Amino acid sequence: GDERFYAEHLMPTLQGLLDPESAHRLAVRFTSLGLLPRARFQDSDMLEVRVLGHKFRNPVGIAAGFDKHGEAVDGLYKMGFGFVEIGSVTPKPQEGNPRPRVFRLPEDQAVINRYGFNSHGLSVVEHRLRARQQKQAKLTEDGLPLGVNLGKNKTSVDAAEDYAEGVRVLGPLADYLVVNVSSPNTAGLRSLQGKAELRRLLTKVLQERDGLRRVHRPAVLVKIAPDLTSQDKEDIASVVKELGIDGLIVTNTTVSRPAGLQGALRSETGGLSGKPLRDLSTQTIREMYALTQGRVPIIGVGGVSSGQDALEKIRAGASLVQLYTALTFWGPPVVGKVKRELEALLKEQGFGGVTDAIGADHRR
Numbered sequence: 001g002d003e004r005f006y007a008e009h010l011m012p013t014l015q016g017l018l019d020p021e022s023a024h025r026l027a028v029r030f031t032s033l034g035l036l037p038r039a040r041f042q043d044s045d046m047l048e049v050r051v052l053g054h055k056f057r058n059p060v061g062i063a064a065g066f067d068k069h070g071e072a073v074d075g076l077y078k079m080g081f082g083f084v085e086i087g088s089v090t091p092k093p094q095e096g097n098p099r100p101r102v103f104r105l106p107e108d109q110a111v112i113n114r115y116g117f118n119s120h121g122l123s124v125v126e127h128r129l130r131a132r133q134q135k136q137a138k139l140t141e142d143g144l145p146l147g148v149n150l151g152k153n154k155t156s157v158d159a160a161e162d163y164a165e166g167v168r169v170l171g172p173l174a175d176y177l178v179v180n181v182s183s184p185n186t187a188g189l190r191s192l193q194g195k196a197e198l199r200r201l202l203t204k205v206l207q208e209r210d211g212l213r214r215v216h217r218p219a220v221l222v223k224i225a226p227d228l229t230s231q232d233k234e235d236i237a238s239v240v241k242e243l244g245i246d247g248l249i250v251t252n253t254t255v256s257r258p259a260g261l262q263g264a265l266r267s268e269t270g271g272l273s274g275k276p277l278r279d280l281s282t283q284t285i286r287e288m289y290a291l292t293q294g295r296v297p298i299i300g301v302g303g304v305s306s307g308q309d310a311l312e313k314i315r316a317g318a319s320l321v322q323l324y325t326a327l328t329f330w331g332p333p334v335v336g337k338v339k340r341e342l343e344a345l346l347k348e349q350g351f352g353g354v355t356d357a358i359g360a361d362h363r364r
């Protein structure tokens with residue numbers, strides 16, 4: 001589990017052999033088999049966070065899109081993540097976009113993807129989660145919660161029914177559900193972020209959620225884009241407070257292409273993730289936290305690869321953070337690296353723990 005060794009030798013060699021999608025499939029396979037160093041970092045109490053009705057023993061999660069179909073959940077906890085989000089999962093199985101559909105931008109430490117919600121579908125994922133449901137219940141009680149990210153099928157007419165089906169089928173197996181209305185890779189999906197569509201969609205989602213038995217009733221979060229207008233953000237904040245939405249995930253990938261991208265593949269269609277997304281995401285967190293008066297838990301995501309990156313999002317208003325793209329460049333040791341650096345920085349800056357740092361920039 002040598003950070004320098006994975007970063008300098010292992011990851012580049014696998015990247016040099018495999019196209020990104022093959023590398024991803026292989027990584028999911030290795031992870032699901034537990035073929036990783038069991039992370040040696042023991043989580044300090046400073047890293048514990050209580051939010052969303054749960055204890056999280058550390059605030060660093062794996063973002064949706066890595067384990068799309070719920071195959072590697074246990075291997076991901078073994079890697080040291082404090083929580084795992086699987087998905088997005090669509091109601092029916094679907095293949096997603098034609099290949100190639102994932103591209104590396106090594107010079108930018110970025111990735112562009114246009115998977116298009118390739119998904120084994122609700123039924124397959126439901127059976128997969130059911131087979132380990134009681135083990136997850138113990139993990140959750142031990143501070144390692146599970147989130148499920150819901151998508152909608154390409155040919156679906158009623159998006160709200162797609163999401164409602166997801167709540168009914170996977171809601172009982174999740175600590176939190178994410179309504180993903182921000183994928184750049186499904187036509188018309190992001191328009192669900194608009195005020196009228198969003199209110200109607202989320203009213204239905206919450207009704208379905210509230211109809212679940214108490215012990216099987218997940219928190220509901222909305223995952224938003226980094227490309228929203230100020231008007232969009234105000235409207236989302238308003239709907240979230242009107243309806244009692246439990247939290248926000250901020251942010252998905254960007255359809256923008258920031259000035260300065262060097263990668264040859266920078267003009268590929270898709271969502272861009274990684275370092276060029278980092279500060280755009282951080283600023284969106286800052287804005288959403290202010291618009292919700294610090295009362296709505298935020299999971300911050302986008303370009304996190306270090307303790308400093310994590311702490312900047314936490315200070316901007318995130319209670320938890322996730323990463324994905326960094327894992328593809330640095331490998332598994334990046335998880336312990338982020339946690340160890342985060343702990344050191346919290347101590348350097350005079351915080352008793354993560355909880356004290358949440359939103360600290362707003363109180364300056």
Ligand SMILES: Cc1cc2nc3c(=O)[nH]c(=O)nc-3n(C[C@H](O)[C@H](O)[C@H](O)COP(=O)(O)O)c2cc1C
Nearest residue numbers: 063064065087088113252273274302303323324325
């Ligand atoms: C290859 C790939 C697939 C992704 N698939 C999903 C997805 O299915 N659902 C979702 O909500 N986000 C998905 N994401 C977005 C991540 O969850 C995250 O929001 C984004 O990548 C920014 O975080 P990062 O810079 O640490 O990668 C995907 C990202 C990548 C790179």
Ligand SMILES: O=Cc1ccccc1/C=N/Nc1nc(-c2ccccc2)cs1
Nearest residue numbers: 020023024027030031036327328331332
């Ligand atoms: O290579 C590009 C890429 C693009 C999209 C999604 C994943 C990847 C590659 N990921 N490579 C990873 N390898 C691991 C890994 C896991 C266990 C042992 C060694 C490496 C985790 S993520």
Ligand SMILES: O=C(O)c1cc(=O)[nH]c(=O)[nH]1
Nearest residue numbers: 115116117183185253271
């Ligand atoms: O499946 C996708 O392509 C996908 C979904 C999503 O939510 N975000 C992303 O970058 N890609």
